Amino acid sequence: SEPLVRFKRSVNITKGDLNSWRTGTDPCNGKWFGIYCQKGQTVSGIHVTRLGLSGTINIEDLKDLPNLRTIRLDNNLLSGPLPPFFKLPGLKSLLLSNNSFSGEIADDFFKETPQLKRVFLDNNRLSGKIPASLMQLAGLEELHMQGNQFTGEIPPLTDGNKVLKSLDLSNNDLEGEIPITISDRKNLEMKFEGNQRLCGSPLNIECD
Ligand SMILES: *[C@@H]1O[C@H](CO)[C@@H](O[C@@H]2O[C@H](CO)[C@@H](O)[C@H](O)[C@H]2NC(C)=O)[C@H](O)[C@H]1NC(C)=O
Ligand SMILES: *[C@@H]1O[C@H](CO)[C@@H](O)[C@H](O)[C@H]1NC(C)=O
Numbered sequence: 722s723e724p725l726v727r728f729k730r731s732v733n734i735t736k737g738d739l740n741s742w743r744t745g746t747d748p749c750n751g752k753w754f755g756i757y758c759q760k761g762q763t764v765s766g767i768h769v770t771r772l773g774l775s776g777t778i779n780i781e782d783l784k785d786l787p788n789l790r791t792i793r794l795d796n797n798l799l800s801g802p803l804p805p806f807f808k809l810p811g812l813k814s815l816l817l818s819n820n821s822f823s824g825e826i827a828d829d830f831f832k833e834t835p836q837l838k839r840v841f842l843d844n845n846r847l848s849g850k851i852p853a854s855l856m857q858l859a860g861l862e863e864l865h866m867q868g869n870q871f872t873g874e875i876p877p878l879t880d881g882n883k884v885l886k887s888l889d890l891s892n893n894d895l896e897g898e899i900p901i902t903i904s905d906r907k908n909l910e911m912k913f914e915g916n917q918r919l920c921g922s923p924l925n926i927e928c929d
Contacts, residue, residue, distance in 0.1 A: 722748050722764050725785040726756070729767075733776025735798070759788055766791035766814075773797060778804040787811075790836075795819060803847065807834050814839040818865075825849030831858055843889065844868035851876055851890075860884060867891040867912065878902040885909060895919050898928050 723744055730742050742753055749758035757766030764786050774797035793816035800821040813836050822845040831854040843865045850873035859881035867889045874897030889912040898921035913924055920928030
């Protein structure tokens with residue numbers, strides 16, 4: 722569990738240090754900063770933030786951690802397309818706040834990620850239509866996508882979801898009627914401000 726983690730460290734970091742993720746030491750000894758471990762034995766989360774990570778994530782390295790469940794890479798400089806996080810089958814928490822990931826996410830990106838409870842993609846530069854499969858996750862509880870450049874209509878949310886309690890789509894450029902699959906729910910903190918073109922809604926604008 723040491724060599725793949727330091728494959729992942731060896732991309733591009735511009736602010737701060739390892740320090741350290743030594744290749745010949747166990748990452749659950751308690752010295753490895755920013756690592757979480759199930760039961761003091763195996764790696765289950767990566768939590769590294771504000772290091773100016775400017776390189777590229779190679780998810781084949783992260784696939785060699787079989788019980789990794791949480792990734793939190795908030796406030797770095799990661800850019801390019803969104804890496805294929807769907808290749809990690811047990812992933813529960815994907816936190817990539819304030820990075821610079823760009824481009825359109827494949828609509829089928831979340832077809833085979835039923836374990837995801839939390840997806841924070843806010844304040845990147847993602848574009849082009851929220852993937853419909855994201856809104857088909859029955860177990861998605863927290864989805865924060867504010868501050869991107871998403872366009873098009875919001876996909877409907879499946880009735881199979883009974884746990885979504887926080888949805889933030891503010892400050893994008895979304896268009897259609899806000900789906901009543903979302904707005905009817907009485908336990909859902911939802912946010913849609915700063916989305917001109919958007920109507921229906923908890924917002925006070927018809928639609929039409
Ligand atoms: C994403 O970036 C913003 C900008 O820094 C963070 O929001 C600010 O957070 C500071 C705390 O350091 C607050 O004092 C400001 O009021 C916040 N400003 C705004 C406009 O929200 C935000 O927390 C970052 N997201 C994460 C997860 O760290
Ligand atoms: C990583 O850094 C090296 C030099 O430090 C550079 O050649 C390479 O292009 C960088 N890659 C990314 C994705 O920033």
